[PDB]
Amino acid sequence: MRECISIHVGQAGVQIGNACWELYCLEHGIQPDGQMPSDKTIGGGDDSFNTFFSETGAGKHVPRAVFVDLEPTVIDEVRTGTYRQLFHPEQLITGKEDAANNYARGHYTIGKEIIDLVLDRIRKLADQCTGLQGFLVFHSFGGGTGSGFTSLLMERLSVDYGKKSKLEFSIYPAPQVSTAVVEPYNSILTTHTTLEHSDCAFMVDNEAIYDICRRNLDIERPTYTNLNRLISQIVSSITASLRFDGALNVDLTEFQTNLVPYPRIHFPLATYAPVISAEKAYHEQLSVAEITNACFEPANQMVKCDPRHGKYMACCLLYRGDVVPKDVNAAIATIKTKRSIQFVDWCPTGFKVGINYQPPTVVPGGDLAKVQRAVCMLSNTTAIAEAWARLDHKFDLMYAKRAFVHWYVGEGMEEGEFSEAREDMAALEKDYEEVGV
Amino acid sequence: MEVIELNKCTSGQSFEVILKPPSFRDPSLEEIQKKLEAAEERRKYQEAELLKHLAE
Amino acid sequence: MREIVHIQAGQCGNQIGAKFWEVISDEHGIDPTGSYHGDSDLQLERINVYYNEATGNKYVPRAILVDLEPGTMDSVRSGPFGQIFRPDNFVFGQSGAGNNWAKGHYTEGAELVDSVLDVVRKESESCDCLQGFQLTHSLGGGTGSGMGTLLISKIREEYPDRIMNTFSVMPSPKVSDTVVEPYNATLSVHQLVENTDETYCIDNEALYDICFRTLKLTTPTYGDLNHLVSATMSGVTTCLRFPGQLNADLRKLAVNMVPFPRLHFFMPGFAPLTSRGSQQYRALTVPELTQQMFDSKNMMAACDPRHGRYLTVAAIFRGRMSMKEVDEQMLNVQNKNSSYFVEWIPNNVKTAVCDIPPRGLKMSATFIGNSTAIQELFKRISEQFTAMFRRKAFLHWYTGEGMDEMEFTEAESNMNDLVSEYQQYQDA
Amino acid sequence: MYTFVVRDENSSVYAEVSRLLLATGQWKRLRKDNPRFNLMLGERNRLPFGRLGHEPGLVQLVNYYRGADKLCRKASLVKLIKTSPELSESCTWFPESYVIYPTTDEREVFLAAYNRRREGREGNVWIAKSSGEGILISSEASELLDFIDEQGQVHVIQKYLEKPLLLEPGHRKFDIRSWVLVDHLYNIYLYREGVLRTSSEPYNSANFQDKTCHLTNHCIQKEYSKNYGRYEEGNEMFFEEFNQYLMDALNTTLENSILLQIKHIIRSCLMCIEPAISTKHLHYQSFQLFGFDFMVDEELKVWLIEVNGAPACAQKLYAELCQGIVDVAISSVFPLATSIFIKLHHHHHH
Ligand SMILES: Nc1nc2c(ncn2[C@@H]2O[C@H](COP(=O)(O)OP(=O)(O)OP(=O)(O)O)[C@@H](O)[C@H]2O)c(=O)[nH]1
Ligand SMILES: Nc1ncnc2c1ncn2[C@@H]1O[C@H](COP(=O)(O)OP(=O)(O)CP(=O)(O)O)[C@@H](O)[C@H]1O
Ligand SMILES: Nc1nc2c(ncn2[C@@H]2O[C@H](COP(=O)(O)OP(=O)(O)O)[C@@H](O)[C@H]2O)c(=O)[nH]1
Ligand SMILES: COc1ccc2c(c1)NC(=O)CN2c1nc(Cl)nc2cccnc12
Ligand SMILES: [Ca+2]
Ligand SMILES: [Ca+2]
Ligand SMILES: [Ca+2]
Ligand SMILES: [Cl-]
Ligand SMILES: [Mg+2]
Ligand SMILES: [Mg+2]
């Protein structure tokens, strides 16, 4: 067994962290006080869930978790909230003043004053680890903290822990719920600075999650609680293989060998089905065929794009519930004949399948209904470069007038980092275009 | 349509299904602390130019 | 990013500043003694942004009252909420400033400024995390205009990393104490474009026209004008004072609203427009709030938004209404009038909502626009300035206090430069 | 007030559609790069489909189907027809065709079926084309195999129809152009008015290099062909006149002899690529107007030549067709305060 440390940076990272650790606890039957009745090796062990939880003499199960925000409001809610007992106070790190939606303020200015403390609290958990695999890093592209501090943290984690793997859960900016107008600037700056420090990054467009909540949960105006419980289900599907007995995606290095053959093209598309409202009186349950088929509807994707007009380099299916290999193979065989699934000339046209027989766990009084089978598809398709094109365009519109640049230069950043960050992104859009056309 | 490396256990199963085969400087602690100090220098410069202007 | 330190300077600064503390103390459940007799908890969640907690669990405004004559400030003590204010925060000289920028900035004002900065320091030291400062002042007199801008300069020197926010009342021949207002205003705007992060342009021309044309008041008083001011001030400070999905501060407002550091002069708007006392009983519908709040007639700065383009917009909906209707209407305005919103700042309109409505209305919208049309305000005051300055008319009042013609020529120039920059981004 | 933008200033058809939309007073036009459009009348190259359908509070429609170029570029059309099971290699309405690169490639497989039409004593003449801008029709192809192992792009070598149907008086050639509108629901709408682009020079079986009696393009008939506008104005025969001729001269109708085969090839071609280009469950919607170009042979068999993704209409029809694009493709999605088209639908049970 090899430990994984989760790091939650900024509001987006922290709130999504809450959502995931709440769900993980319900899945592993860990209670809010941190007690796990089912765990009969008291005071330790090397079970699969110990990847995510350490143990104390009193039989308390504690996340391998660091929360970091440059402002206390959101982590104060964790500190006084339903899971207050679960966390070690030293895992919850806050400053006094936030990065005011400014990459440069989060990275250079307020960053520097807190980076060494954070790395010290990260080193305390790494020292309670017999064999650290590496890190799961949760953040927004859009936030000054989410963007700017995360990229400083990632540069240093590469230095202090060079052999260890680093995965991202990254919230891509959507105007309908965004707070700031400079999120395209923050997004590009942090992508550029973070790109070589990240083995595998799962991007979630708040736009996709917002519309899944409207369309499939019948929620007029989805809140962060709505978006976050849905996102936490998808993260739980992706991480289940690290926390459960299995032979697929068993360690963080396998995510890279299975999903990322080209190291820069490290942005796998997550598709998830089914999403069903808990207030829907009558729901006729969906088959292995119907939900595998739903993994090829853009309307179910974490990012809206069109996999038909790209190529695949890797495709995993992660099933939860009453699924058996025969149904998957029949489902998969039907789906090839109906849909455009083109792989790159230099990859096997294949799927890697993982089945965990425990159906998805839903939070009591949540918006998501129990289902007897769900799937999360992780496909590395070139179609996701559509998200980079949208974002780079927004960036070019603003940067052409140097609109808001003065806020970044005022925090000690050079106008040149903008055009450097945008060149890297032009190079990234080109890599995707070469591979996929 | 070939089904391979089927692994089973109490918790679930995993396997790979294949249809067609192939149609065939992470910088130092030092360099970082120089970037962060260079930025702080430009910030202290810009603040000195303001306090000079205000002194005028 | 908790505490805001408020300063009110001169007659207008203090009359408007007082009505602010009246209106905002009623919204947060605070009585004229400092005792909280409220009922909601959204009231006290961020009370510390504007109030210090004192002995007895009492709330005292983080407010400093500055004048070069005692008149208006003895009228604040006397007024309804006078007793709320910390008595040590009343700083006054005795000479007055005679509607003279030079007396405020260079002679009478310098004598008193250091006293003000001591009380500013006593409030700032007590602060867990100071966001910065908001100042209420006219630009047309001597104290608020000339001393107020001297303060702003000293405060930036001593707190250069804190946000400076002003509610700056612009003068108008329609509501005019003296001929020298264009002089006082042009000298003040020069200071404002250098030394503030964000300025609410509150145009006495607009407040008069709303009182006459819309509210049907034949003879509008400073009370009628100050009703519109106190409603807007409540409006634009909502997301600083109340918890919502947007928990804003003066910095985040500045970063998101100001794309170029000199273009930080906001055109505020309010709906529905009320004349005090007689308030109609027909609650306004979200479509109506949205149409009015963006209407020229609802703008507190006498500019036509159709003669410019919106760089950025912030909109506050107050009361119990459909979140979904608010997003629908806000998207309808932009998609239906998309020419008037720069294409080179994507998603430049941001909307917040607050359940607590202002006293006397079930539903209200407050508008904050960084429009390039605000140039019209600055061109108006430039024309009034040049009409006199071409003949050095009334200048003796200023040369008598040590000022040189040069300083007037420099200020004329900075303001005309400001107008060229607004023009620059109107034709992008 | 619905909003549109115009990003192809040279589009004959959409110039006229923007005009008809304004003239309703329910559509205003925005600046090219204003992202807050309902309708994009888009560029021909690198249309940024990835920026469509991410504008909250705006249903967005574009006048192109992403992926439709598979049907509308020569070499890809040949690969599509040869590789798609639903239009086999046997496919009886496409001329035998081979994709050939300048020095993947089919050249080895081209000579096997070509050198059976030496042994066969069959009239073994071909054509080669790109995607009269450099066309050649040679008997043996000493020239063709070499001609464009020389010039820029990849090329298609396509059976030449030696024995075409002959319009009289004239002993001349033609191609038929049909306009097909695919709406957002993937309704396939054939416009009832087609056009025969005609040669004016009698067809010559022995002199092939005379690209005048062999090539039927509107451009070529004004420059090289001297009998322009002799029989019909201007080398454009419409459907009333061609129907009448077929009735008078062969005793059939346009409907039976030709149009059943055209309707079959159109619905066969578009139903093939439907799963690749459909916008049914997408976050933006596509329509597109195609120009299908057919050759009729002397036994009255229709053959598909090429599909055009950015076609121009013929002068008199602009008014009618463009109004139809609005009624069917635009007003269906964005509604205001005798159909022009024949809907191609077939549900045979087997
Ligand atoms: N899905 C999701 N997105 C969130 C959440 N909170 C914020 N965001 C998004 O994140 C972006 C804003 O970044 P934040 O994470 O709030 O910023 P921060 O990292 O706290 O940084 P500063 O406040 O700028 O110092 C916007 O696109 C928001 O919509 C959340 O709980 N869930
Ligand atoms: N296989 C074939 N047999 C007989 N004639 C042919 C032929 N292929 C092409 N032609 C002739 O050439 C003309 C069409 O050439 P091509 O298909 O390249 O058109 P084009 O793309 O250059 C202009 P358009 O886009 O309007 O069709 C026809 O009108 C016909 O006269
Ligand atoms: N809106 C408003 N304007 C005022 C008020 N009092 C004065 N003014 C305007 O303020 C200017 C005169 O400045 P004033 O504040 O009296 O001078 P000071 O006391 O020297 O700062 C003129 O333009 C007046 O029209 C007021 O209470 N409300
Ligand atoms: C144009 O984009 C914006 C405009 C105003 C804002 C933002 C974005 N984002 C913020 O965090 C601050 N902000 C706001 N700040 C305040 Cl004090 N008030 C507001 C009221 C409505 C909308 N926005 C704001
Ligand atoms: Ca154990
Ligand atoms: Ca590395
Ligand atoms: Ca004196
Ligand atoms: Cl290491
Ligand atoms: Mg934050
Ligand atoms: Mg006065």
PDB file of C-alpha atoms in Angstrom, chain C residues 331 334-339 343 347-348, chain D residues 3 28 30 33-34 36 55-58:
ATOM      1  CA  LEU C 331     -28.814  38.308 -20.067  1.00  0.00           C
ATOM      2  CA  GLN C 334     -26.723  42.441 -22.789  1.00  0.00           C
ATOM      3  CA  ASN C 335     -27.867  40.131 -25.699  1.00  0.00           C
ATOM      4  CA  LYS C 336     -30.511  42.790 -26.739  1.00  0.00           C
ATOM      5  CA  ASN C 337     -28.054  45.823 -26.594  1.00  0.00           C
ATOM      6  CA  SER C 338     -24.672  44.072 -27.148  1.00  0.00           C
ATOM      7  CA  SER C 339     -23.144  47.037 -29.112  1.00  0.00           C
ATOM      8  CA  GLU C 343     -16.418  42.962 -27.023  1.00  0.00           C
ATOM      9  CA  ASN C 347     -18.618  38.625 -19.613  1.00  0.00           C
ATOM     10  CA  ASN C 348     -18.223  42.245 -18.368  1.00  0.00           C
TER      11      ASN C 348
ATOM     12  CA  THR D   3     -29.136  38.568 -33.757  1.00  0.00           C
ATOM     13  CA  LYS D  28     -30.475  42.919 -36.452  1.00  0.00           C
ATOM     14  CA  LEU D  30     -23.915  42.443 -35.079  1.00  0.00           C
ATOM     15  CA  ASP D  33     -16.550  39.109 -33.666  1.00  0.00           C
ATOM     16  CA  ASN D  34     -19.560  39.967 -31.385  1.00  0.00           C
ATOM     17  CA  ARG D  36     -23.658  37.238 -28.574  1.00  0.00           C
ATOM     18  CA  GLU D  55     -23.140  31.736 -24.586  1.00  0.00           C
ATOM     19  CA  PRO D  56     -25.679  31.489 -21.746  1.00  0.00           C
ATOM     20  CA  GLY D  57     -29.212  32.722 -22.693  1.00  0.00           C
ATOM     21  CA  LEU D  58     -28.541  32.345 -26.488  1.00  0.00           C
TER      22      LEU D  58
END
